[PDB]
Design a protein around this nucleic acid. Structure first.
Ligand code: SF4
Ligand code: CA
Length: 345
DNA sequence: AAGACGTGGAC
DNA sequence: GTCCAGTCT
């Protein structure tokens, strides 16, 4: 019942779509950026980051020419930082290889870093009108209910099935609007919990509603604890010691206060050791937890004084207090410094 | 295939 | 506490 369906949806959308920052226009650059920021992040959280990110990087060219340090800083606190590392690379590519023009061909655009099945569809359909599916979490929840599909949405296979379902019901006339409508619906009406089926504009076509199982869909499956000792080294009144994390793995390329994964009870010994401009640490300042998707950091901050006996090399870099605000730190280490400041005062 | 990969704001 | 809001390997 395509046409019938892809009509009440596009209508509801027309009068119900939220005026979000990235919806001011259909510029591929703006769209691409927002589609990447919204991955595993709520709109409310993203809005401020988007305004800021665009003010700072108005065009793809600006983003491409932008240094990498500045880019991570604009993403500071958003999470899954590899998203911006990939976007920065993909953009640098679009300008050097495609003349600052975003490829409008699924195959071409899909080769860029960070661009997956969903992003290919989202950007190209919303910006260029390419009839490709834009299946994300919200969409799978909506489609699993409309068509009462019980396959584990976690399986790529399931996603593929859903992508097939979209190709057979999308308004090939206006794919872009059709793809957003489906997403808004999942964001505003067909919510994870307590879906507002009574107010939904496509209840007529929903099998899950007819069966009374809407709240049970979609179907999906269901971490490692890690002790971390952190050292805040301060100079004879001034600079503190920090280092740029490895470019691969956890919190890649972000700055942090020197630390070590004790994986046990090493403690101040572990940190005092890693030093090898030596130094010694005092008693802890505070211990707290910080969660990631796949692990939890049980942090322990250790105060300390630095004594210069050599140059600051390797990953390390000496930094004056008033300059820490220039470096991008994970939320975890932003608290390490917060706690530290409310300690010495 | 399924673990890696941040962070926060409803329930 | 729990449940989300995609891509790479
Ligand atoms: S009827 Fe209810 S379950 Fe079906 S799509 Fe609308 S909100 Fe989702
Ligand atoms: Ca791809």
């Amino acid at each position: 019942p395509a046409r019938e369906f892809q009509r009440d949806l596009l209508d509801w959308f027309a009068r119900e779509r939220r005026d979000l920052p990235w919806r001011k226009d259909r510029d591929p650059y703006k769209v691409w950026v927002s589609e990447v920021m919204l991955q595993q992040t709520r709109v409310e959280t993203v809005i401020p980051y988007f305004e800021q990110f665009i003010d700072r990087f108005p065009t793809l060219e600006a983003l491409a020419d932008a240094d990498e340090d500045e880019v991570l800083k604009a993403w500071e606190g958003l999470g899954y930082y590899s998203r911006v590392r990939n976007l920065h690379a993909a953009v640098k590519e679009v300008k050097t290889r495609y003349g600052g023009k975003v490829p409008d061909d699924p195959d071409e655009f899909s080769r860029l870093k960070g661009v997956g099945p969903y992003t290919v569809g989202a950007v190209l359909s919303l910006a260029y009108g390419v009839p490709e599916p834009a299946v994300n979490g919200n969409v799978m929840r909506v489609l699993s209910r409309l068509f009462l599909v019980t396959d584990d949405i976690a399986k790529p296979s399931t996603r593929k099935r859903f992508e097939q379902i979209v190709r057979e019901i999308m308004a090939y006339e206006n794919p872009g609007a059709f793809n957003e409508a489906l997403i808004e619906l999942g964001a505003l009406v067909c919510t994870p919990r307590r879906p507002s089926c009574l107010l939904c504009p496509v209840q007529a076509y929903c099998q899950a509603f007819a069966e009374g199982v809407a709240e049970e869909l979609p179907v999906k499956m269901k971490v490692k604890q890690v002790p971390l000792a952190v050292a805040v080294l301060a100079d004879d009144e001034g600079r503190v010691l920090i280092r740029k994390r490895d470019s691969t793995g956890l919190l890649a390329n972000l700055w942090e206060f020197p630390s070590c994964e004790t994986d046990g009870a090493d403690g101040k010994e572990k940190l005092e050791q890693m030093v090898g401009l030596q130094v010694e640490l005092t008693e802890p300042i505070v211990s707290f937890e910080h969660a990631f998707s796949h692990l939890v950091w049980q942090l322990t901050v250790f105060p300390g004084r630095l004594v210069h006996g050599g140059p600051v090399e390797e990953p390390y870099r000496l930094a004056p207090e008033d300059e820490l605000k220039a470096y991008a730190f994970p939320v975890s280490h932003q608290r390490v410094w917060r706690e530290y400041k409310e300690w010495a005062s």
